């Protein structure tokens, strides 16, 4: 039920829906999410997009 995640790896998004992010970035999940890819907002860069859940872990 945590909403804040940290990026565990750098990720280059392939599509316009997805967020690129770098290892260590703090990401907050936005709205209702299900499945494997979740809409997120980077607290580090301000960008938004879908993230792959296997690239992140719950964070403070």
């Amino acid at each position: 039920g945590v909403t804040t995640f940290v990026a565990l790896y750098d990720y280059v998004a392939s599509g316009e829906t997805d967020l690129s992010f770098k290892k260590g970035e703090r990401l907050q999940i936005v709205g209702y999410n299900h499945g494997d890819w979740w809409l997120a907002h980077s607290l580090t860069t301000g960008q938004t997009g879908y993230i792959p859940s296997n690239y992140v872990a719950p964070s403070d």
Binding site: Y9, D10, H34, G35, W37, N54
Partner: peptide, 12 residues
């Protein structure tokens, strides 16, 4: 709905 349910990328 499809955007959430897409295959994941492999880990690096």
């Amino acid at each position: 709905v499809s955007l959430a349910r897409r295959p994941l990328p492999p880990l690096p």
